[PDB]
Assembly symmetry: D2
């Protein structure tokens, strides 16, 4: 589990459940290639996106579909999505947790990077 | 103006208006003595709490009545309040802005400290 | 595990390890009674503070000694501590996760409250 | 002035000065077209990006070059940048302030949207 994504709802103090997440990797030609996708579980987490061996050095983008999450709750939020873009594994393999905290007009994101 | 508080509402995407703010200094016997108060303006700001000459070195507490704010909006809050506590002026007088971001189950606070 | 506390360092993207945490409960006379204490583990977490049966309804305060954490890293931070104050269990038993995100001049806190 | 960006540095407790900011509109073919740019002032603010008449309804992207900011300070950053993407003006013209808080491994962003 070198990459996991966790999403929380700051209005309810809860996991944000069933949030779509798409991950991309920047190719050598500079385009963004689809890399993995999934949706958050009942705990707000999304595990199993990749493997140590597939998750090579590169620039990755995690796109969180926050707008659909809010719209299903009846809210028209500010952001179209939350996108988190980062270089991974540039000094060897690491485990990444991308946390995102949602409010209708704000989001926060934090990365926790550990060396297993 | 040595101490400013600024509050934003992450649910509405607005300044947090009419939020009550109380300021305390720590007394000799470790108790919190009341020092200033006010409420945020239509821009979410509260100015005028103290003056340069009264705002001497010491430990100060700012307590933001978030619970009453959310209750006035009809939104269920988690916290009783949001407090910063900080030592002021320890390397000379400074201007302090306490920037606060509010959600019902989360807040943030940040000091912006500038030299006069 | 009705109460857990998790602390992260936003400078390094890591758990904040060995952070002291003191929990208080407001007594019927309005004073703050010591309730539990501990320090964060290697994962930034502090588990085992209380039990379902001891953690009755009340107003609780979680005091995080963030200043000592920064000072051990050579930094003189803004805040003396981070304090999180909240009513717990007012509509029956819940599980509370109090997360805190530390920077030298900022902290963030989020509560995740689940019904087991 | 319909679009303002304001950036704070949670490590220094200061405005984030000289941060490069690029603004894009989404074109008919889904591509991002460059729209404005600038850098934050000594107060961490960037004003003057557009005018009321040019800032028509559409989807806009603001991309904040956080990586270069942290590199200029000698501090190792996680993200390549911080971006908001939002639909503007969907219920009439608004003034938008994008408030951004930066740490090396975390950021936040919040929209403060006021009616003219």
């Amino acid at each position: 589990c070198p990459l996991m994504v966790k999403v929380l709802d700051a209005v309810r103090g809860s996991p944000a459940i069933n949030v779509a997440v798409h991950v991309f990797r920047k190719a050598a030609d500079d385009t963004w290639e689809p890399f993995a996708s999934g949706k958050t579980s009942e705990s707000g987490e999304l595990h199993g996106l990749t493997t140590e061996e597939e998750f090579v050095e590169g620039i990755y983008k995690v796109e969180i579909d926050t707008k659909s999450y809010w719209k299903a709750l009846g809210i028209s939020p500010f952001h179209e999505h939350a996108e988190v873009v980062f270089t991974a594994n540039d000094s060897g393999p690491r485990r990444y947790t991308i946390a995102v905290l949602l409010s209708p007009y704000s989001y926060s994101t934090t990365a926790v990077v550990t060396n297993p």
